[PDB]
């Protein structure tokens, strides 16, 4: 499955300037375009090398779309203050994410066209791509407005057509790097703790994509017995990192083996303290 998605943010700062507005496009979690209102003459900019082959028309068109979108959000931020009876003094955040997830076949697996206000769901186009689910009565006002205007049809047209068409185009533009798989450079560290036992930590560095499965086994078994791990984390260069550890009795380290699973590994890895 592959995806083309745009993440948009509008943050107000009443009395101190126009709302900060941002748009970020991603193809399978890879950022390729971004528009930041914070510049003298803001425009959409390339973020991946494979999007630089898009001609000038494309960039001026998207820049115009982004500015048009920025205007709607300024109005939205004002409307939200009235819907929620809030004062014009505080900063508020309005977010939007729209895009498509398309199966290997070219069929639309799932479409997105949803919003959030101050950190939580506000409204979302349902999977039927026809009706909406509102988070509260304020958002219900929006829903009634959009259903009566039939705004969903316009959104669905984009999700099933243009979004899908361009995702396919992008996947060709970036064939070389959008499907890259950097295998993990794995090693095991041994730490003796005050408790008397030992912490065996299995490390995985410089891999890509972020997806990965690190597991520990005892004499080749279901060592799911509570192991410690951390959230997969990024590096400046775009690769990821992760580790998983378990406590073991000092003297029986060679009994435990770490197994690393990753898309870039034709065959899973098995490491020992050795």
């Amino acid at each position: 499955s592959h995806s083309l998605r745009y993440f948009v943010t509008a943050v107000s700062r009443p009395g101190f300037g126009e709302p900060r507005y941002m748009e970020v496009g991603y193809v399978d979690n890879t950022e390729f375009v971004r528009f930041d209102s914070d510049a003298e003459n803001p425009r959409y900019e390339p973020r991946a090398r494979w999007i630089e082959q898009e001609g000038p028309e494309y960039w001026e068109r998207e820049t115009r779309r982004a500015k048009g979108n920025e205007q709607s959000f300024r109005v939205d931020l004002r409307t939200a203050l009235r819907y929620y009876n809030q004062s014009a003094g505080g900063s508020h955040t309005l977010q939007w994410m729209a895009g498509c997830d398309v199966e290997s076949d070219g069929r639309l697996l799932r479409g997105y066209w949803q919003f959030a206000y101050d950190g939580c769901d506000y409204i979302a186009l349902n999977e039927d791509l026809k009706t909406w689910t509102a988070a509260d009565m304020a958002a219900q006002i929006t829903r009634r407005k959009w259903e009566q205007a039939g705004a969903a049809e316009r959104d669905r047209a984009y999700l099933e057509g243009e979004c899908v068409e361009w995702l396919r185009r992008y996947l060709k533009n970036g064939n070389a790097t959008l499907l890259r798989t950097d295998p993990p450079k794995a090693h095991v560290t041994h730490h003796r703790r005050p408790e008397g036992d030992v912490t065996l930590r299995c490390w995985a560095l410089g891999f890509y994509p972020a997806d990965i499965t690190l597991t520990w086994q005892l004499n080749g078994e279901e060592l799911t017995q509570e192991m410690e791990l951390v959230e997969t984390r990024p590096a400046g260069d775009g690769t990821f990192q992760k580790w998983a550890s378990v406590v073991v009795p000092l003297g029986k380290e060679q009994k435990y083996t770490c197994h690393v699973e990753h898309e870039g590994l034709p065959e899973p890895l098995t490491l020992r303290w050795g």
Partner: peptide, 10 residues
């Protein structure tokens, strides 16, 4: 290419 709000405000 991205989505357009097309002035369909909340």
């Amino acid at each position: 290419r991205g989505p357009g709000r097309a002035f369909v405000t909340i």
